[PDB]
C-alpha cells in the first residue's frame, strides 16, 4: 500500500458480536415469556467476550502495530462524533415521551403534573449532589486531558482516578435514590419516564466509567503519548455527553417536572 | 494548562461536591410515608414482572413502595 | 510500573503470519475457542428454544 | 356505498364531500397533466438521432423547474386549505352522538336527553336477508336526522379503531382515553355505509358502520319509542 | 484468496448443473418459507 | 512531572514511517494533493508510481464536478482525454 | 338545551378535556350545594354538558372511583 | 460492453432445462401448500 | 480459507456480495408474502380462513421488503461495492465493523421468522401501533421478537451509517472535494445521515413499547397517563425519513444509469442534484404527521403538515427534470438497465404525484387507510426501489461477477415486470377512491373486479421473478468474461476490471490541484 489507511486482518468478532445480539434478544424473550435466564446469560457473556477481544485487537493494531496514522485517527474522530449523535437522538425520544406526558396530563393522572399520588424527589437534595458530581468530573477529566498533553503521567493518573471516583459516586448515589424512591417504574407515566430515561442515563454512566477505567489501565501501561491518545479523547467526549444528558434530565424531569 | 484545570478541580469543583454532600447529609432523614390510596394510574400490573412473585418492582423498598393491595 | 510497550510492539510485529486476534499466543486461541463455542452452542440452543416455542 | 367497477369517489352525501369531489377533480387534472408531460418528454428525448453531449448550463432552466412547480403547489394548497378551514368552522350542532369502537363492533350513545345506547354488529353472510350487502349490514343502524349539523364523538374501549363514512367525507380515529370530534350533515335521507379504518386485529374487515338518515319528525318518533 | 470471474463468490460456478441445484435450493427455500409458515399457523 | 512517552520515542509501524517522511517533506503515503505544473509537453505533471501504471483523475478546470479517470502508463507522456493536460509516470 | 354548545376553551378535535372539565364542574358544584344543604339545580348546566359529551363508561368509571376514594381529580 | 465468447456456451436445450428447473423450484412447494389448504 | 473469507470478512466487495445475496433471498420471502396477500384478495370470501394469519402475512411482507430486501441491497450491497471504488479508496473506514452490520441481519431475520412461528404471530401492521401491539391484544412473544428484530436491524444500519459517512468524508483523494464525488456517493452519504438521526428515535419508541409489554410502563397506556398517539409520533418521526432512505440510493443509481446509457460524461445540473437530495433529506424530517391526519390533531397543525409535505415536490421535480435533461442530446443505448431507469422515472413520478394528493389533509380524511395509500407507495416505493435495484443490478452485474447477462432475456424480464406491477397496482387507485380499506382480508362485493385484476397482475410479476433467477443462472452457466466497457473516464468503479481484484487502490489515484 502507498495509502495511509488500515486494511484490518480478517476477524471473528463481528460474527461473535452479531450472535451475542441474537442470544441477548432471544434471551430477553426467553426471560419475559418462558421463565428462563439461560440464553440471556450466554448472550451477556459472549457480548462481553466480543467487546473485550475486539477493543483489545484495536489496541494491538494501534499502540503495538502502528496502524493509526493521522488519516486513520481522523476517521475514528468522525466515527465517535457520529456515534454520540446517534446516542443524542436515542435520548431525544425519551425526552419527547416525557414532555408529551407532562405537558398534557390526562384525566387518569388528575389532569395535573406531577400526577395525583406522586411525591417527587426534592431536586435540591441528592439530584443536586449528582449534578455537582458529574459537573466536577467534567473539570477533572479536562485536567487529565491537559496533564496528558503536557507529558505529566502522575497528574494525568490522579485527575483520571478522581474522574472515575466521581462516576462511581454518582452511580452509588443513583442506586441509593432508586431504592429510596417512593414511586416505581409501574407508577404510571411519571414512573415510566423517570426510570426509563434516568435508567438509560445510568447505563451510559456505567459504560462511560468503564471506558475511563480502560483508559486508566492503558495510561498505567504507558500506551498513550502526549500527542496520540484517541481512546482517551473518545472517552472524554463520551463522558461530556453523559454530563450534558444529566443536565437535561435534571432541568426537565427532576426540577421542571417536580 | 493542566495547572489551571487542577486549580478548578480542587478550588471550585470538589468544594462544590463537599457542600452538596453536606447539604444532602443534612436532609437525609426518613420522610413519614403517605396514606395508601389504591389509585388506578399507579402500581400498574398488566403483566407479572419476570422475577420474584411477579408483583414486586425490581428495587422494591417495603418501607416506601406499597403493592397494589397496600404496604407490606 | 515501567514502560514495556517496545516489547509488546516486537511481539505484535513478529513475522509469524498470525492474525492480530491470535498473535498474543496460546491464551488468544483459548479465549477465541471459548467465545465461538458459546456463540455457536448458544445459537443452536436458541434454535431448539424456537422449535419448542413454535408449538403449544 | 361503492358499486361494481367504480373508478372514483362515492357520490357526495354532505356539502364537504361535494367540496372534496371538486377539489379532487382539480388536483387529478394537474396529476394527469404532469404525468403526461413527463411521459411525453421521455418519448421526445428518446426519438432523435441529433446529439449534444458537451456540458450543458443548467442555471436558466432550473428557474423554470422551481418557479412553475411552486406556483402549481400554491394552486393546489389554496383550495385544499380553504376546505380544511371550512371543515373546522364553528357550527351549532343540534345533536351529539358518541361511538365507541370495540373488538369487533361499534356501540352508540345518545345521551343529550335520555341514556340511549346500543351495540352495532355486522350481519354474518349466512344471516343476510335477500338483497342485503355482504360485510356491510349491521343489526342496529345509527338513526340520525337529515339536513342537521350533528356532532359525532369517537373513542374506543380497547385498541385503535377508525370510524369512517366515505360518502359523508368522514374518518375519525377511535383512540382509548381520547374523545375525537367530527361534524356530520347529510343533505339526503337514506343508508350510508362505512368500515373500520384502523387495523384492530383479526376482525378489522368485519365491523361496519351504517347511518340511517330520516326526517327530524321520524328521528324524534324513533328516540321517543326507545324509552 | 482466489481472484477473477467465478472466484469472488461463496458459491461454485465450476459446473452449471450443480450451480442450478444450489440456486434452486437458495431462492426456492426463500420463496417456500412463507407458504410453510402459513401451513404451520393453520395446523395449530 | 514527566513519564509520558512521545510519538518520537514510541510511534511504530506505518504511523512512524508517515511521521519520519513528513519531517523530511516527503509524501510516500499520498496524504497531500500534488500541485499541478503547467501540464505542457515540456512541463508534464510528474506522477510517481511504485509500478508501471497508475490511475490519474484530472479535474480539468477548477470547480469542475466531473473528474476524468484514466490509466497513465510508463513511457511517453499521456494527455487527459478531456483537456489535453500532459502527465508523465516517474516510477 | 338541545346539546352542549361550542366552547371556545375546547375548540379542537380532542374533546377529552371538555368532558373532564364539565364532569369536575358538576361534581364540585354538587359538593358546594350539598355542603350547605343548598340546591343542586344550580349545577344543571354542567350536568347536561358532561352527560352529552362524556362516554357512559368514563362517567361510570369516575363515579366508581369517587365512591372508592381513588378519583384523582380535585372535587 | 464487450465480452469473450462463452467459455461454456448454454444451448437452447440447456436453457429450456434451467428455466423449467427454475420455474418448478418456485411452483411445486407453494403449489403443494396451496393445494392442501383444505387439509390444514 | 472459506470461513476466513466469507464469515470473517474485512473486504468491502465480499461484504457487498454477502448483502446482495442476503437481499435477493429476502426478496423471495417478501414476494412469497405479497402473493399470499393477493391470493386471499383474489376472490371474495376467505382463502386462509384465519384473518390473524392474513394480518401476520401483511406485517411480515412489509418488514421483509423494507429491512431485509431494499436497505441491504441498496446500502449494504451497492453501497459497499461501489462507494470505495467511486472515491478510489482502499476499503471502508471501519472494515471490521462493516462485517458486523452484515452479520446482524441473519439474526434480525431469524427473530422476525420466530415472531411468525410462535403463538399467532404479530398481526399488527408494520407500524406496530399500541394498543393492538400491546400485551393484552397481542399477548405472548410475537410482538417482542418483532421489536428485537427491529433493534438488530437498527443497530446494523446505525453502525453502517457511521461507516459510510466516515468513509465518504475522510477517504477521498486529498484533491477531491465533496463537489467532485459522484451522485451515487452523495445519495449514500445523505441516506446514512437520515439513518443516523431517525433509527435512534424508532429504537426509543419500540423500547417504550417493549417496556409497556413487559415492565409495566404506561408510555402508550391511558390508564397510566400514557397516549397511543405518542407511539405514532415516535414511529413516524423515523418512518418518513425511512421512506426517503429507501429511495435516495435509488436516485443515485438512476443518475449514474441515465448518464451512462445517454453516452454522457456527466449528469445534467450536478450541483442541483446534490441540492435536491440534501433538500429532500432535510424536509423529510419535518413532515411525519401526514401519517396522522385522522388521529384528531389541531387544524393549524394539519395546515402546516399539508404545506411542508408539498414543498418536497420542488427539489424532487429538479431531479426528474435533470434526468430528462441528461437524456436530452444523448446517443441513447437501449440497454436493459436504461429500460429499468426509464420505467423508474415514469412510475416514480406517478407515485410521487399521488403523494401530493395525499398531502392534502382534507382529501387524506377520505383516502387515509384505503387502497389509495397502498397504490401510492407501491408506485413510488415498491416500483421506484425495485426498478432502481434491477437497473443497478443489470448495469453492475458484469463489474461484480466478471460475466455478461443475455441482453434480450433481460429486456424480456423488464417487459414482463412492467406489465405485472401496473396490472397489480393501478386498479388499487379505484379501490381507494371508492372506499376499500387497507389491511382487509375480504371486501364488500362491489370491489371484486379490481381485486381480481390486481391479484392476476401479482402472478405476472411472479413469472418475472422466476425468469430473473433463470437469467442470473444463464450468465454464470455461460461464462462470457467482460473485456472492455465504454465511458471508463467518468465511471471509475470499472477501471480495475471485472471483477476488480480483492484489493483495489493499494496505490491510490493521482489527482492534482
Ligand atoms: C432466517 C435466517 C436468515 C437466512 C438468510 C440467508 C440468506 C443470506 C445468504 C448470504 C450468503 C451466505 C454466505 C455465507 C458463506 C456460505 C457458507 C456455506 O454453507 O457454504 C456452502 C455454499 C456454497 O457451496 P459451494 O457451491 O459448494 O461452494 C463451495 C466453496 O465455494 C468451496 O469452499 P469449501 O469447500 O471450504 O466450503 C464449502 C462447504 C463447506 O464450507 C464450510 O466449511 C462452511 C461452513 C460454515 C458456513 C455457514 C454459513 C452460514 C450462513 C447462514 C445464513 C446467512 O459448503 C457446503 O457445500 C455445505 C454448507 C451448506 C450450508 C448452507 C448455507 C446456505 C445459505 C443460506 C440459505 C437459507 C437457508 C434457510 C432455511 C429457511 C427455512 C425456513 O455457500 C452459500 O451459502 C452460497 C449461497 C448459495 C448460492 C446462491 C447463489 C445465488 C446467485 C445469485 C446472485 C445474486 C448476487 C450477485 C453477486 C455478485 C457477484 C459477485
Ligand atoms: C400495462 C399494464 C396494464 C394496466 C392495468 C389495468 C388497469 C385497468 C384499466 C382501467 C379501465 C377503466 C374503465 O372501465 O374505463 C372506462 C371509462 C368509462 O368512462 P366513465 O365511467 O364515464 O368515467 C368518467 C368519470 O366520471 C370520471 O370521474 P371519476 O371520478 O369517476 O374518475 C376518477 C378516476 C377515473 O380515471 C379514469 O377515467 C381512468 C384513468 C386513466 C388511465 C391512464 O381515476 C383516478 O382517480 C385514477 C388515479 C390515477 C392516479 C394518477 C394516474 C397517472 C396516469 C399516468 C398517465 C399516462 C398517460 C398515457 O373510461 C375511462 O375514463 C377510462 C378509465
Ligand atoms: C420510496 C418511498 C416513498 C417516497 C419517496 C414517498 C414520497 C412521498 N409521499 Fe409517500 N409513502 C410511502 C413511501 C414513499 N412516499 C409509504 C411506504 C407510505 C405508507 C406507510 C404506511 O402507512 O404503511 C407513504 C404514505 C404517504 C402519506 C400518508 C398517507 C396516509 O396514510 O393517509 C403521505 C401524505 O402526505 C405521503 C406523501 C408523499 C409525498 C408528498 C411524497 C413526495 O416526496 C413525492 C414528490 C414527487 C413528485 C411530486 C413527483 C416528481 C415531481 C415532479 C415531476 C415536479 C412537479 C410536481 C408537482 C408540481 C406536484 N406518502
Ligand atoms: C419495498 C417495499 C415493498 C415491495 C417491494 C412490495 C412488493 C409487493 N407488495 Fe407490498 N407492501 C409494502 C411494501 C412493499 N411491497 C408495505 C410497507 C406494506 C404495508 C404493510 C402494512 O399495511 O402494515 C405493503 C402492503 C401490501 C398490500 C396491502 C395489504 C393490505 O393492506 O391488506 C398489498 C396488496 O396487494 C401488497 C402487494 C405487493 C405485491 C403484489 C408486491 C410485489 O409482488 C410487486 C413486485 C415486486 C417484486 C416481485 C420484488 C422483486 C425484487 C427482488 C426479488 C429482489 C431481487 C434482488 C436482486 C436482483 C439483488 N403489499
Ligand atoms: C444505578 C444507576 C443505573 C442502573 C441501571 C439499571 C439496573 C438494572 C438493569 C439494567 C438496564 C437498564 C436500562 C434501561 C431499561 C429499563 C428499566 C431500567 C431502569 C431501572 O432500574 O428502574 C428500576 C426498574 O427496573 C426494572 O423494571 C428492571 C430492569 C431490568 C430489565 C430490563 C430489560 C429491558 C432491556 C431493554 C433493552 C433495549 C435495548 C435498546 C437497544 C437499542 C439499539 C438501537 C426501578 O426500580 P423500581 O423498583 O421500579 O422503583 C424504585 C422503587 N424504590
Ligand atoms: C460492568 C460493565 C457493564 C457494561 C458494559 C457495556 C460496555 C462497556 C464498554 C465501555 C467501552 C470501552 C471501550 C474501550 C475501547 C478501547 C480501544 C481504544 O480506545 O482504541 C483506541 C482507538 O479508539 C477507538 O477505537 C474508539 C472506540 C470507541 C468505543 C466506543 C465505546 C462506547 C460504547 C458504547 C457501548 C454501547 C452502548 C449503547 C446502549 C444503548 C486506540 O487508539 P489510541 O487510544 O489513540 O491508542 C494508540 C496510541 O497508543 C498510539 O500512540
Ligand atoms: C436489546 C439488545 C440489542 C442490542 C444488541 C447489541 C448489538 C450488537 C452487539 C454489539 C457488539 C459490540 C462489539 C464491539 C464493536 C466495536 C466497534 C468499534 O469500535 O468500531 C470502530 C469503528 O466505530 C467507531 O469508531 C465508533 C462507533 C463505536 C461503536 C461501538 C458499538 C456499539 C453497539 C450498540 C450501539 C447502538 C446504538 C445506540 C444508539 C441508538 C473500529 O472499527 P473497526 O472496523 O473494528 O477497526 C478499524 C481499525 O482501523 C481499528 O484499529
Ligand atoms: C458451558 C456452558 C454451560 C451452560 C449453562 C447455562 C447456565 C444456566 C443453566 C441453568 O438454567 C437455569 O435453570 C433454572 C431452573 O432450574 C432457571 O431458574 C429461573 O426460573 C426461576 C423459577 O423458579 C426464576 O426464579 C428465575 O428466572 C430463575 O431462577 C434459570 O432461569 C435458568 O437459567
Ligand atoms: C456451550 C453453549 C451453551 C449451551 C446451552 C446450554 C443449554 C442448557 C439446557 C438447560 O435447559 C434448561 O432447563 C431448565 C430445567 O429444565 C429450564 O428451567 C426452567 O423451566 C422450568 C420448567 O420446569 C421451570 O422450573 C423454570 O422456569 C425453570 O427451572 C430452563 O428454562 C432451561 O434453560
Ligand atoms: C426537460 C427536458 C430538456 C431540457 C433540456 C435543457 C437543456 C439546456 C441546454 C443548455 O445547454 C446549452 O445549449 C446551447 C446549444 O443549444 C449551447 O450553446 C450552450 O453552451 C449550452 O449550455
Ligand atoms: C403463489 C404461487 C403458486 C402458483 C401455483 C403453481 C402452479 C402449480 C404447480 C404445481 O403444484 C402442484 O400441483 C399438483 C396438482 O396439479 C399437486 O398435486 C396434488 O394433486 C395431484 C393430482 O390432482 C395429486 O396426484 C398429488 O398427490 C397432489 O399432491 C402438487 O401437490 C403441487 O405441488
Ligand atoms: C506510585 C504510582 C506510580 C505509577 C507509575 O508511575 O508507574 C502512582 C502514580 C499515580 C498513582 C495513583 C494516583 O495518585 C491516584 C490514586 C491515589 C490513591 O490514594 C491511591 C490509588 C491511585 C489510583 C494511585 C495509585 C498509584 O499510587 C499511582 C498509579
Ligand atoms: Cu375495528 Cu378495524
Ligand atoms: Na379474502
Ligand atoms: Zn483534464
Author numbering:
A (entry chain P): 4 to 261
B (entry chain T): 12 to 83
C (entry chain W): 1 to 56
D (entry chain O): 1 to 227
E (entry chain Y): 3 to 46
F (entry chain S): 3 to 93
G (entry chain U): 11 to 85
H (entry chain Z): 1 to 40
Describing publication, verbatim:
The FO − FO maps of CO2-treated–untreated and N2O-treated–untreated CcOs in the fully reduced state showed clear residual electron density in a site (site 2), the same as the Xe2-binding site. Therefore, we assigned the electron density to a single molecule of CO2 or N2O. At site 2, CO2 or N2O was oriented to form weak hydrogen bonds with both the hydroxyl group of Ser108I and a water molecule (Wat2). In the FO − FC maps of CO2- and N2O-treated CcO in the fully reduced state, elongated electron density was observed at a site (site 6) the same as the Xe6-binding site. Because the electron density was significantly stronger than that in untreated CcO, it was assigned to CO2 or N2O. Previously, infrared spectroscopy detected N2O-induced secondary structure changes only in fully reduced CcO and not in fully oxidized CcO. This may be consistent with the binding of N2O at site 6 in fully reduced CcO. The O2 consumption rate slightly decreased in the presence of N2O.
pmcCytochrome c oxidase (CcO), a terminal enzyme of the respiratory chain, catalyzes oxygen (O2) reduction coupled with the proton pump, generating a proton-motive force across the membrane. Mammalian CcO consists of three mitochondrial DNA–coded core subunits (subunits I, II, and III) and at least 10 nuclear DNA–coded peripheral subunits. The electrons from cytochrome c are transferred through CuA in subunit II and heme a in subunit I to the O2 reduction site, which consists of heme a3 and CuB. Cytochrome c oxidase (CcO) catalyzes oxygen (O2) reduction at the heme a3–CuB site in the transmembrane region of the enzyme. It has been proposed that the hydrophobic channel that connects the transmembrane surface of subunit III through subunit I to the heme a3–CuB site is the O2 transfer pathway.
